[PDB]
Amino acid sequence: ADQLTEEQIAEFKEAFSLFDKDGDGTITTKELGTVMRSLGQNPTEAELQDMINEVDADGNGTIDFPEFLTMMARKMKDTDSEEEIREAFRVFDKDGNGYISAAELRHVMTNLGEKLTDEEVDEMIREADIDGDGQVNYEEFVQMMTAK
Numbered sequence: 001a002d003q004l005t006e007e008q009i010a011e012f013k014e015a016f017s018l019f020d021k022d023g024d025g026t027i028t029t030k031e032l033g034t035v036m037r038s039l040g041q042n043p044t045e046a047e048l049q050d051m052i053n054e055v056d057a058d059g060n061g062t063i064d065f066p067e068f069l070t071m072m073a074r075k076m077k078d079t080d081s082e083e084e085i086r087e088a089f090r091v092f093d094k095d096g097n098g099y100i101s102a103a104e105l106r107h108v109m110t111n112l113g114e115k116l117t118d119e120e121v122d123e124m125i126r127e128a129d130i131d132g133d134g135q136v137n138y139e140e141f142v143q144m145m146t147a148k
């Protein structure tokens with residue numbers, strides 16, 4: 001939390017929900033793998049376990065919200081962060097026009113079993129929509145995933 005802006009924190013609150021499949025309040029190594037693979041990533045089992053252990057501050061084997069924020073902050077500094085962020089953007093920009101629309105955001109959420117509401121989709125876009133065109137372009141997506 002001490003490394004992120006209030007907007008990033010807001011976005012990640014929703015992202016935490018995407019990773020928490022069963023919705024038990026914590027993210028497991030398995031859930032992390034499934035969701036990351038769905039978001040254009042391809043981490044090995046050892047890399048997933050390291051990701052968890054590195055920010056699992058209370059050593060309970062799972063990741064809660066505060067620990068998740070730490071994971072996201074560190075992720076933004078990965079040596080291959082640019083590539084990872086590009087691959088994630090690709091997953092959202094289904095029609096490849098360079099913009100993530102509300103329809104495309106709803107599609108990713110629904111594919112991830114995440115129930116949604118228009119108000120929720122509007123807020124997610126609003127938090128990253130710098131030029132205010134109602135969509136999230138690559139530059140805006142990168143900014144949201146940039147450590148400040």
Ligand SMILES: [Ca+2]
Pocket residue numbers: 019020021022023024025026027028031
């Ligand atoms: Ca869970």
Ligand SMILES: [Ca+2]
Pocket residue numbers: 056057058059060061062063064067
């Ligand atoms: Ca933990």
Ligand SMILES: [Ca+2]
Pocket residue numbers: 092093094095096097098099100101104
């Ligand atoms: Ca698009």
Ligand SMILES: [Ca+2]
Pocket residue numbers: 128129130131132133134135136137140
């Ligand atoms: Ca925009």
